[PDB]
Design a protein around this ligand. Structure first.
Ligand SMILES: FC(F)(F)Oc1ccc(NC(=S)N2CCc3c([nH]c4ccccc34)C2)cc1
Ligand SMILES: [Zn+2]
Ligand SMILES: [Zn+2]
Lengths: 179, 177
């Protein structure tokens, strides 16, 4: 017969315990290409409150990388080598990739993964209060894909960044409510 | 061209608003064709733990949450488990739309060919060369071997959907830059 999703039993049976060699692995980054770092940096820092950990430039290859994360800026090492080893050992960073010149091209944009052809869906941020977070987002001119009370899943939002990537806004202590 | 100067970049950065103080970067969502290949890949090859599984029969999809977390840390009772899962940093939400697994004319787009957007997720590891040795041994497909290309000591592998996963050592990137 055709799909009905895996039962917990089938799902749970596909799960292995971590091999000891993987014990110090961490999920360090999600990389997204960005058209204009001026817009993106302003959005991710001012709207969402993330910090720029490091900027890396690769002139020969004509791109820059910007690493953003929820980290205290006073924790960032000043020295470029110690900064680099710190940035790349932090959990949950965003690597924003700037291919030089895209900001000047008015016919160029990246694809957000949510229309054909689909793949990547979104990043997601946990906040203590979705409704107050989104009220602030609204006051700052943030574009919404889904307002918190819109649609089936009440109490949950999606906003877009300056490239159009979707960002889920959720409250971990109330997700239990909205099945 | 020539990129942003540090002064231009840094000048676009605001200090965080206090209302954002408890925000955390909780998930990256990827759509997956076959949850069987994927759970196997991410748990066994990569060593992540399945925190939780969610089903939405009305909409015909399931969500699988994976993260590097000790399973003995997972709340046993089903309600508080969810609030734990959704408060962990750096989880992967894998989205399975029912039926894609049986379809041979379907695959998802990895973001690295036209039209580009998403690039990859990235895993920091203590030793890239032994990790990739183990990966080779389990039959993992590579996009870039660690010694392949200019940037030595850094690898890209593919998951069962074709998404790229960077494999890196934070203490050797400083050398690599
Ligand atoms: F043109 C843009 F817009 F920049 O779009 C892109 C999109 C993706 C990339 N990155 C690619 S294509 N790869 C990563 C590293 C790598 C590839 N083959 C290899 C063979 C040997 C060693 C390393 C590699 C493939 C570079 C530029
Ligand atoms: Zn990367
Ligand atoms: Zn999500």
């Amino acid at each position: 017969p055709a799909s009905s999703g895996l039962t917990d039993e089938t799902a749970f049976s596909c799960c292995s315990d971590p091999d000891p060699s993987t014990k110090d692995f961490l999920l360090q980054q999600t990389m997204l290409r960005i058209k204009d770092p001026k817009k993106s940096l302003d959005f991710y820092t001012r709207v969402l409150g993330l910090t720029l950990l490091q900027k890396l430039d690769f002139p020969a290859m004509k791109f820059s990388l910007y690493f953003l994360a929820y980290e205290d800026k006073n924790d960032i090492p000043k020295d470029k080598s110690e900064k680099t080893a710190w940035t790349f050992s932090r959990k949950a960073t965003l690597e924003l990739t700037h291919n030089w010149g895209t900001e000047d091209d008015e016919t160029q944009s990246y694809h957000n993964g949510n229309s054909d052809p689909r793949g990547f869906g979104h990043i997601g941020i946990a906040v203590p209060d979705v409704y107050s977070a989104c009220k602030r987002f609204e006051e700052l001119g943030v574009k919404f894909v889904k307002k918190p009370d819109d649609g089936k899943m009440k109490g949950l939002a999606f906003i877009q960044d300056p490239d159009g990537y979707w960002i889920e806004i959720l409250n971990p202590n109330k997700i239990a409510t909205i099945i």
